[PDB]
Design a protein around this ligand. Structure first.
Ligand SMILES: COC1=C/C(=N\c2nc3ccccc3nc2NS(=O)(=O)c2ccc(F)cc2)CC(OC)=C1
Length: 822
C-alpha cells in the first residue's frame, strides 16, 4: 500500500519520488523525513477533531467581509422538503429548529446536532451568525433566489471524518579560488563575483582577468573580497556572473556560504549555471538541474582551519520622528544610534532600522539581533513587509512568521499567492515559512487546496521543481484522502488538455459545427465521461462538478481555442449548473494576480460599507501555460450586445441605445432601476481598479455585463501601465448611468462619488498593495520585474500626497476622461 501511495504522489505532483533519492542529498533527505513526520502528526490530530471542528477544517465558513426571506430545507435521507419564512437576522440554529418541528409533525415525532449544507456544494452553514452574514444567504438575496439547504446530522459528518483517514576567530579577508569552466560563446570572458545579504552588497564586486572565449576556460585565481571572514552574516550569499566582452551576458550562479547546518563551506564546488537575460542576487541558490547542457563554474572555498555559525546564546551575549515616515548617510546614523528608542517607542519602524544596520559587521548584527529578540510582535501589514527579499536574515524571517501566525484563514487565503512566491526567495529547503504554510494548509482544506495548485502549476519551472515538489509530497503525507481528491482533478485536467489539442488541430481543418460535434463524440467516450465528471472544481473546492453536459460544451474562437465546459447536478438544482473554461497556450498568472487584487479591493470597500457589486470570478493556473476560468453565466460581452442584431429584443434606432435596450429586456418594468444601479456601482469599481492597476487595452470585447446589470472584465494581458494609462469613461457606460438621458448630472455625479469613495478607500490601504506587489516580484511575471512597476502603484494611488491633493489630482484625471467621452 505504501508503494501505491508513493506512486500516486509521483503522478499527482508531476515528479517521480525516485528523483529525490537519486540526488543523494542530505538536505533533501532531512526535509523529507522531518516534514513527513510533521505532516503525519497534523493528520493524527485531525482524525480526532470534534465534528464541528472537522467541518471547520473541511468546509470552512464563507462569510461576508429586520428583513424576511424564504428558504427551503430537507433532511439527508428523504425527498420531502419544507419552505420556511425566516428573518435575515436569524441564526442557523433557529432555522434548524423550524426544520425539526416540521419533521416532527409530518413524521409524528435537538438543533445542535446538525449543520446546514448548501445543496450540491461542499458548503455549510453553522455558527452564531445571522443568515445574511453567510455569503450564500447574502448572495441569494441579491440574485433573488431562495436558499436551498439540507439538514445534516453529526453522525453523518463524523462518518465523513472517519472515511478520510490516512567563527569570530577568523580575521583573514574572505577569498575564493576560481578554477575553470565549460561553456558556449563568440572576444574575451570575465567572471564577476559579489557578496550579498539580500539586495545590498557586503562589499565591492571583484572580477577575473580577461581570458579568451577559448575552452573549457581555466583561471585558477584567488579572488579576495574587501571583507573579513568573521564578519560574513549567517545568510551570506556568494553570487557569480560570467559574460563576454572585447556587454554580452552568458550565465549566472549563486550559493550560500553556509550550508543548512550553519557550517561554512569548503572546499571545491561545481556550479551549474543558469542562462542569462550581470549579477543576480535574488536568483535561486541551487544549481541548474540540466547538468548535460549547463555551463559549469568550478570554484574552491578555502579551509579556514569544521566551523559553525555561533548560537543565538553567543549572539545575545555579544528630528528622529521628523524623518521617520530612503535616507541620507547621517540620517541613517541617527537611526542606528537610537535603536533602543526605536524598539521602545517605534517598534513598527523595525524595517527602516534593519535596512540601516551594517550587515557586514558581525558586532552590529549581534546588537541588531539582540534587540530583535525582545521586539514586540508587529501587525500583519508590517510582517508582510519583513518578508521582502531585503530581509534575508532568518531571525527576521522567524520574527515575521511569528508576527504572521495571527493571520485569519480568510486573510491567509487572501495573501496565499504572495507567500508562495516568497518561497522562491528562501535560502534553504527547511524554513519557517514552509512549516507555517504546510501547517495552516493541513489545518484548513481550502488553504490546502490552493497551496497545492500554486505549487503544482509551477512544476515545469526547473528553478522551483525540487522545492515545490518536496512540499507537495509532505502535504500528501498529511492528507491521503485529499491526495486522491486532487488526482481526480489532475485526471480531469489531463483529459481537457488532450481534448483541447484535438480542438486546435480540428479547428484548422474543418468548420466549427463539425469540430464541435467531434469534440462531443470524443467527450462521450467512457474514459472521458469518467475523468471529466464527479470532481471538485480546482477553481473552488466547494463547487462540485457533477455530470458534464456534453451538448452544451464547446470552444471559443480566440487563438488558443479555449474549451467551454458545462456541468450539472440534480442534487444542487439550478445552482449546480456551472461552467469552467479550459485554456492551454496562454499564461494565466497575470490574470490571476489582477483578479486577486480586484477582489482585495472589494473586501476593503465592503469593510467600509461600500458594495460596488463586483464579480470576483475564479481564475487558476494549473500547469505549463495551462489553467481554468470560472464561467459567469448569463453574461455577454459589450461587443456582442453592441452587434445590434435585428429580430432580437434589444433593437435600437441608435447604437448608443443597444446596451440599455438589452438591460431593459432582461429587467422588465420596475427591475430596470436596480439593473442601472448595479451597472453604475460595478462600473465605478472597475474604472477605479483598472485605473489604479494600470490595466490598458480595455475595449468592448473584454468587458462583460451580467443580466443583473453588473459589469466586469476579462482577459488582462497587461497591467501597471505596460501596454501611464488614463482613467477611462466610455460614452456607452456614461449613457447607461444617465438612464439614457443626454443630461443627467444627478445620476452622473452619484457615479463620480462612487469612484471617489472607492479610490480614497484604496489609498488608505496603499501600503498593503505595495507590500503585496513587492512580494510578487518573485513570480517572474514579465510586467512585474523591477521598481518602476511598483512606482506605477505609487503614482496611481498618489501615496506621496495628502488626501486633499490626491483627490484634487484624481478629479482632474476623471474630468480629463469625461472630456474624452466624445
Ligand atoms: C469570467 O466569466 C466569463 C468569462 C468568459 N470568457 C473568458 N474569460 C476570461 C477571463 C480571464 C482571462 C481570459 C478570459 N477569456 C475568456 N474567453 S476567451 O479566452 O475566449 C477571450 C480572450 C480574449 C478576449 F478579448 C475575449 C475573450 C466568458 C463568459 O461567458 C461568455 C464568462
Amino acid at each position: 500500500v505504501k508503494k501505491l501511495i508513493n506512486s500516486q504522489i509521483s503522478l499527482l505532483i508531476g515528479k517521480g519520488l525516485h528523483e529525490f533519492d537519486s540526488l543523494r542529498d542530505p538536505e533533501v533527505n532531512d526535509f523529507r523525513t522531518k516534514m513527513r513526520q510533521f505532516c503525519e502528526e497534523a493528520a493524527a490530530h485531525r482524525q480526532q477533531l470534534g465534528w464541528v471542528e472537522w467541518l471547520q477544517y473541511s468546509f470552512p465558513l464563507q462569510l461576508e467581509p429586520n428583513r424576511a426571506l424564504l428558504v427551503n430545507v430537507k433532511f439527508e435521507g428523504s425527498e420531502e422538503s419544507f419552505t420556511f419564512q425566516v428573518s435575515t437576522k436569524d441564526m442557523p440554529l433557529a432555522l434548524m429548529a423550524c426544520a425539526l418541528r416540521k419533521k416532527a409533525t409530518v413524521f409524528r415525532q435537538q438543533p445542535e446536532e446538525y449543520a446546514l449544507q448548501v445543496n450540491g456544494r461542499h458548503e455549510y452553514l453553522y455558527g452564531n451568525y445571522p443568515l445574511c452574514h453567510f455569503q450564500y444567504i447574502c448572495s441569494c438575496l441579491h440574485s433573488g433566489l431562495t436558499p436551498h439547504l439540507t439538514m445534516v446530522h453529526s453522525s453523518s459528518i463524523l462518518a465523513m471524518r472517519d472515511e478520510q483517514s490516512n567563527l569570530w576567530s577568523l580575521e583573514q579577508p574572505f577569498s575564493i579560488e576560481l578554477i575553470e569552466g565549460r561553456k558556449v560563446n563568440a572576444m574575451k570572458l570575465v567572471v564577476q563575483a559579489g557578496l550579498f545579504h539580500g539586495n545590498e552588497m557586503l562589499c565591492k564586486t571583484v572580477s577575473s582577468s580577461e581570458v579568451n572565449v577559448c575552452s573549457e576556460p581555466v583561471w585558477k585565481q584567488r579572488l579576495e573580497f574587501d571583507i573579513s571572514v568573521c564578519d560574513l552574516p549567517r545568510m551570506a550569499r556568494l553570487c557569480f556572473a560570467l559574460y563576454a566582452v572585447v556587454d554580452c551576458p552568458i550565465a549566472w550562479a549563486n550559493l550560500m556560504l553556509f550550508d543548512y547546518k550553519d557550517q561554512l563551506k569548503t572546499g571545491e564546488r561545481c556550479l551549474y549555471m543558469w542562462p542569462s537575460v550581470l549579477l543576480n542576487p535574488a536568483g535561486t541558490v541551487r544549481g541548474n538541474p540540466n547538468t548535460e547542457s549547463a555551463a559549469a563554474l568550478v570554484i574552491y572555498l578555502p579551509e579556514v582551519a569544521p566551523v559553525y555559525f555561533p548560537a543565538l546564546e553567543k549572539i545575545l551575549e555579544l528630528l528622529r520622528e521628523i524623518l521617520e515616515r530612503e535616507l541620507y548617510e547621517h540620517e541613517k546614523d541617527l537611526v542606528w544610534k537610537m535603536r533602543h528608542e526605536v524598539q521602545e517607542h517605534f517598534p513598527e519602524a523595525l524595517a527602516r532600522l534593519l535596512l540601516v544596520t551594517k550587515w557586514n559587521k558581525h558586532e552590529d548584527v549581534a546588537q541588531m539581533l539582540y534587540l530583535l529578540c525582545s521586539w514586540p510582535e508587529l501587525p500583519v501589514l508590517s510582517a508582510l513587509e519583513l518578508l521582502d527579499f531585503s530581509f534575508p536574515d532568518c531571525y527576521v524571517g522567524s520574527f515575521a512568521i511569528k508576527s504572521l501566525r495571527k493571520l485569519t484563514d480568510d486573510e491567509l487565503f487572501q495573501y496565499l499567492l504572495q507567500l508562495v512566491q516568497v518561497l522562491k526567495y528562501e535560502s534553504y529547503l527547511d524554513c519557517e515559512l514552509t512549516k507555517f504554510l504546510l501547517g495552516r494548509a493541513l489545518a484548513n482544506r481550502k488553504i490546502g487546496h490552493f497551496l497545492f495548485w500554486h505549487l503544482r502549476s509551477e512544476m515545469h519551472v526547473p528553478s522551483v521543481a525540487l522545492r515545490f515538489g518536496l512540499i507537495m509530497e509532505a502535504y500528501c503525507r498529511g492528507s491521503t484522502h485529499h491526495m486522491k481528491v486532487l488526482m481526480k482533478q489532475g485526471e480531469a485536467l489531463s483529459k481537457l488538455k488532450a481534448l483541447n489539442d484535438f480542438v486546435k488541430v480540428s479547428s484548422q481543418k474543418t468548420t466549427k459545427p463539425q469540430t464541435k460535434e467531434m469534440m462531443h463524440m470524443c467527450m462521450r467516450q467512457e474514459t472521458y465521461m469518467e475523468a471529466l465528471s464527479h470532481l471538485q472544481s480546482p477553481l473552488d473546492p466547494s463547487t462540485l462538478l457533477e455530470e458534464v453536459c456534453v451538448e452544451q460544451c464547446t470552444f471559443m474562437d480566440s487563438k488558443m481555442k479555449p474549451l467551454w465546459i458545462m456541468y450539472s447536478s440534480e442534487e444542487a438544482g439550478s445552482a449546480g449548473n456551472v461552467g469552467i473554461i479550459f485554456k492551454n497556450g496562454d499564461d494565466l498568472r497575470q490574470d490571476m494576480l489582477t483578479l486577486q487584487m480586484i477582489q482585495l479591493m472589494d473586501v476593503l470597500w465592503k469593510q467600509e460599507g461600500l458594495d460596488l457589486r463586483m464579480t470576483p470570478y475564479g481564475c487558476l493556473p494549473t500547469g505549463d501555460r495551462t489553467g481554468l476560468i470560472e464561467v459567469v453565466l448569463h453574461s455577454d460581452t459589450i461587443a456582442n450586445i453592441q452587434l445590434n442584431k435585428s429580430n432580437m429584443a434589444a433593437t435600437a434606432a441608435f447604437n448608443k441605445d443597444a446596451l440599455l435596450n438589452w438591460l431593459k429586456s432582461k429587467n422588465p418594468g420596475e427591475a430596470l432601476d436596480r439593473a442601472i444601479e448595479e451597472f453604475t456601482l460595478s462600473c465605478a469599481g472597475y474604472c477605479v481598479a483598472t485605473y489604479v492597476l494600470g490595466i490598458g487595452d480595455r475595449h468592448s470585447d473584454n468587458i462583460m455585463i451580467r443580466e443583473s446589470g453588473q459589469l466586469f472584465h476579462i482577459d488582462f494581458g497587461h497591467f501597471l501601465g505596460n501596454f501611464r494609462v488614463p482613467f477611462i469613461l466610455t460614452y456607452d457606460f456614461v449613457h447607461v448611468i444617465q438612464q439614457g438621458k443626454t443630461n443627467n448630472s444627478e445620476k452622473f455625479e452619484r457615479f463620480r462619488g462612487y469612484c471617489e469613495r472607492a479610490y480614497t478607500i484604496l489609498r488608505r490601504h496603499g501600503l498593503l498593495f505595495l507590500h503585496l506587489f513587492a512580494l510578487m516580484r518573485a513570480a517572474g511575471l514579465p510586467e512585474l520585474s523591477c521598481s518602476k512597476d511598483i512606482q506605477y502603484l505609487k503614482d496611481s494611488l498618489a501615496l506621496g500626497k495628502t488626501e486633499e491633493e490626491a483627490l484634487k489630482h484624481f478629479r482632474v484625471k476623471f474630468n480629463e476622461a469625461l472630456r474624452e467621452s466624445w
